[PDB]
């Protein structure tokens, strides 16, 4: 109806708020307008089966993981230190976040499927390392609960665990240890591969993806002053 024209306009405005040369973060001043837009789109029957434009999956991932730039030795905005406690480690949310990260890698690959190839392969490796990082820290969050929610822990390990048995048998064993011991283990693996490195990997994956798509398709992610530079 007029609903389609409205929804497409609202989506265009969101594009204006969401696509960022760096990473999207939501300032207090835009929070009401971004919220009204998401809600409108979220209750429009027109949009119930429309495909999520990838810029929204990218903004959602930037938001959800509080992504901060980590640099082509460029200019710097005034940003903050990385912290996994701005991140909401919750099974449903993080599961969906992995679906959307998968959407993004999917469209990246559809793009690269019609130099370029070092971008493509950088992206592939970044992606695997990021996906893994997210699963690892979701695991850590499950292991620090008392009592452990075993159902969701296992459903999660099934869906997103690349873990063959050398890991999730070890993970299950670790799971039914007493809480203080699980906390010791988690704290050791956290110190052995800290969130900051996965913030870097995910940041770089997203920027690398942005660049790829602006360059080899008709996406614009404000990467232009990055292109030959």
């Amino acid at each position: 109806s007029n609903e389609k024209i409205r929804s497409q306009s609202v989506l265009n405005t969101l594009e204006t708020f969401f696509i960022k040369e760096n990473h999207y973060d939501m300032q207090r001043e835009e929070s009401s307008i971004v919220n009204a837009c998401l809600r409108y789109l979220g209750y429009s029957k027109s949009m119930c089966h429309e495909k999520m434009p990838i810029f929204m999956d990218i903004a959602f991932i930037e938001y959800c993981f509080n992504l901060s730039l980590d640099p082509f030795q460029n200019l710097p905005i005034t940003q903050t230190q990385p912290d996994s406690q701005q991140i909401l480690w919750e099974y449903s949310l993080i599961s969906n976040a992995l679906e959307r990260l998968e959407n993004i890698e999917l469209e990246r690959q559809n793009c690269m499927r019609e130099n370029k190839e070092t971008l493509n392969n950088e992206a592939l490796k970044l992606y695997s390392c990021a996906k893994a990082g997210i699963c690892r820290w979701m695991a850590f969050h499950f292991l620090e609960q008392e009592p452990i929610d075993h159902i969701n822990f296992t459903k999660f390990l099934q869906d997103w665990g690349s873990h063959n048995e050398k890991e999730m048998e070890a993970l299950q064993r670790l799971s039914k240890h007493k809480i203080r011991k699980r906390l010791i283990y988690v704290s050791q693996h956290k110190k052995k591969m800290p969130w900051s490195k996965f913030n870097s990997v995910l940041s770089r994956y997203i920027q690398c993806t942005k660049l790829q798509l602006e360059v080899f398709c008709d996406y614009d992610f404000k990467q232009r002053e990055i292109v030959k530079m």
């Binding site: 695997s128 390392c129 893994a132 690892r136 591969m193």
Partner: peptide, 6 residues
């Protein structure tokens, strides 16, 4: 372990 790089 996990699936690392540099």
């Amino acid at each position: 372990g996990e699936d690392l790089e540099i």
